[PDB]
Amino acid sequence: AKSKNHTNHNQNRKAHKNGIKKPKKHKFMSRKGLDPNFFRNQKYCLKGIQKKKKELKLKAKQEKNN
């Protein structure tokens, strides 16, 4: 009628069977809920940079064909 009710015998043997896994160490993370009013400005900065870069690319495509 009465039986066992707790132990953790054997538990880390199973844990170390397939090693202790680490996180995957990515390069970028998502800035979803992070500091507002600083990343909206960053979006504006990157839009300006992209406009300049693509204007130069279009210009070069315009001269090179004469």
Binding site: Q11, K14, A15, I20, K21, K22, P23, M29, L34, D35
Partner: protein
């Protein structure tokens, strides 16, 4: 019944040390933190806002968010076969600039000049640290008067 509350088992961990009670100093509020810095979490029990949980006392992580009076930290934690990343949000009084990284920085700054000189004179120098090892032979001069003879002691 079982009692697993939020601050259970924090009698000696969360209490001020001897003759060192009181709130923090004014210079505590002038510390400089940036994104990606290393940081230590040490709970200060004289400020009850932004209190970290029991487990994360004495751990080290990296910053991923800064606010008016708070800091977000990335901390590892082991769960039964894997390590999970946790995002801990604490107030600024429970945060300390980490000191675990200073030997690397001093080593880089110091070795830069050595490399600059070595390449200046076209040399082949080693800059990796050195494990302690065996010792060379030496000739040790001692007068026969300074040697003292000892033997086991009788029991009293």
């Amino acid at each position: 019944g079982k009692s697993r509350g939020k601050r259970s088992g924090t009698r000696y961990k969360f209490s001020k040390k001897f003759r060192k009670h009181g709130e923090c100093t004014a210079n505590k509020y002038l510390e400089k933190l940036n994104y990606g810095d290393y940081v230590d979490i040490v709970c200060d029990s004289t400020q009850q806002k932004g209190m970290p949980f029991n487990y994360y006392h004495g751990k080290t992580g990296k910053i991923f968010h800064i606010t008016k009076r708070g800091v977000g930290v990335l901390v590892n934690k082991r769960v039964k076969h894997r390590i999970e990343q946790k995002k801990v949000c604490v107030r600024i009084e429970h945060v300390r600039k980490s000191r675990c990284n200073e030997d690397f920085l001093l080593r880089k700054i110091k070795n830069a000049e050595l490399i600059k000189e070595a390449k200046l004179k076209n040399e082949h120098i080693n800059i990796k640290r050195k494990t302690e090892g065996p010792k060379p032979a030496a000739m040790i001069k001692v007068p026969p008067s300074k040697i003292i003879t000892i033997e086991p002691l009788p029991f009293y």
